[PDB]
From a paper:
β-Propeller proteins are common natural disc-like pseudo-symmetric proteins that contain multiple repeats (‘blades’) each consisting of a 4-stranded anti-parallel β-sheet. In the larger propellers a so-called “Velcro closure” is found, in which the N- and C-terminal β-strands are part of the same β-sheet, keeping the propeller closed. This “Velcro” can occur in different positions; in the “Velcro 1-3” variant, the closing β-sheet consists of one N-terminal and three C-terminal strands, while for the “Velcro 3-1” variant, the opposite is true. Starting from a highly repetitive β-propeller sequence, we designed a consensus motif sequence that formed a perfectly symmetric 7-bladed β-propeller.
While the space group and packing differ between the crystals, the structure is identical for each protein. The crystal structures also show that the proteins are highly internally symmetric with a backbone RMSD between individual repeats below 0.3 Å. The characteristic hydrogen bridge network in WD40 repeats, between a conserved histidine, serine, aspartate and tryptophan is clearly visible in the electron density, see Fig. 4. Analysing the thermal and chemical stability of the [name]-T permutants revealed that nvWRAP-T, lacking the velcro closure, is just as stable as the variant [name]. While v31WRAP-T is considerably more resistant to GdnHCl induced denaturation compared to the other proteins, its increased thermal stability is not that significant. From this, the fraction of denatured protein could be calculated by assuming the protein is completely unfolded at the highest concentration. When possible this data was fitted with a Boltzmann-sigmoid curve to determine the concentration at which 50% of the protein is denatured and the proportionality constant (m), see Table 2. [name] remained stable at high GdnHCl concentration thus fitting the data was not possible. A striking difference however is the stability of the “non-Velcro” variant, the least stable for Pizza but as stable as the natural “Velcro” position in [name]-T. This may be due to differences between the sequences, as the two different “non-Velcro” variants of Pizza have different stabilities as well.
Residue numbers in the entry: 1 to 286
């Protein structure tokens, strides 16, 4: 059920994240800003500095660092006062996503330059993971931090260890993979794809399930904190909720354009969805 609509961005909203305490929402947007919101929907700050569209946003687990990915080829790190701390340069094309390791001391970035780059918390470039043959669209850490998952326009998910050694390539999607997520218990990987499906995989690389129902590209996927519910965002303007057995639970309609990402609150009580209609919408579990 729709709880709140966050209006303020002047262009498409490309991503959304909850602060670790769940009291602050961060939105990324094509208007070159990240915005920080409260639960009532009141805008708190606007983070300016990127020279192009912002494609993703993430909080460090301690809640003290905000990372933003941008088409200007950089990741920028900010404090909770909206002040710029650092700019991570190195990617040769647009940065499409960013994520913090579970211990918060390593940062992974995905780029259209076909690589994932691993960075220390304080900006040092650690590794460049090469293997994808097209743009990398998203990245995620396993909750034990021992594995990294990367989604790519080359239609695969790749699984890496923290040395940057490629462990698995997940093959099955018919078009670009747009996002990837680990289940909280780490046993399940979910992938979203332009082929209109979500696919569920085990860490041994085996296809478990294909979640069908969306009528356009699936742009993102997320696991509830308890691991029992899957949320999918789609260019068909909806968010869909599924169970671990692939059954469609319910469909969240309300956005007037494509939904670009989705996230659960840390406490599992709220779903946030970002849309090309320039808003973030907050939903309850019912
Ligand atoms: Cl726009
Ligand atoms: Cl490419
Ligand atoms: Cl870690
Ligand atoms: Cl939950």
């Amino acid at each position: 059920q729709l709880l709140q609509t966050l209006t303020g961005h002047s262009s498409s909203v490309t991503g959304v994240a909850f602060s670790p305490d769940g009291q602050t929402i961060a939105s990324a947007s094509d208007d070159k800003t990240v915005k920080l919101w409260n639960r009532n929907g009141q805008l708190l700050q606007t983070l300016t500095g990127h020279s192009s569209s912002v494609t993703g946003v993430a909080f460090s687990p301690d809640g003290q660092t905000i990372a933003s990915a941008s088409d200007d080829k950089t990741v920028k790190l900010w404090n909770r006062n909206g002040q710029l701390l650092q700019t991570l340069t190195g990617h040769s094309s647009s940065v499409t996503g960013v994520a913090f390791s579970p211990d918060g001391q390593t940062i992974a970035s995905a780029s259209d330059d076909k690589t994932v780059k691993l960075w220390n918390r304080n900006g040092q470039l650690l590794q460049t993971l090469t293997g994808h043959s097209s743009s990398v669209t998203g990245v995620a850490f396993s909750p034990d931090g021992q594995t990294i998952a990367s989604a790519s326009d080359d239609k695969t998910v790749k699984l890496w260890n923290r040395n940057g050694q490629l462990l698995q390539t997940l093959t099955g999607h018919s078009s670009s993979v747009t996002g990837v997520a680990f289940s909280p218990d780490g046993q399940t990987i979910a992938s979203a794809s332009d082929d209109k499906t979500v696919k569920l995989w085990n860490r041994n690389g085996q296809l478990l399930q294909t979640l069908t129902g969306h009528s356009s590209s699936v742009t993102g996927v997320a696991f509830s904190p308890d691991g029992q519910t899957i949320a999918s965002a789609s260019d068909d303007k909806t968010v869909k909720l599924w169970n671990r057995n692939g059954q469609l639970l319910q469909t969240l309609t309300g956005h007037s354009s494509s939904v670009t990402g989705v996230a659960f609150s840390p406490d599992g009580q709220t779903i946030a969805s970002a849309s090309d209609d320039k808003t973030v919408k907050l939903w309850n579990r019912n």
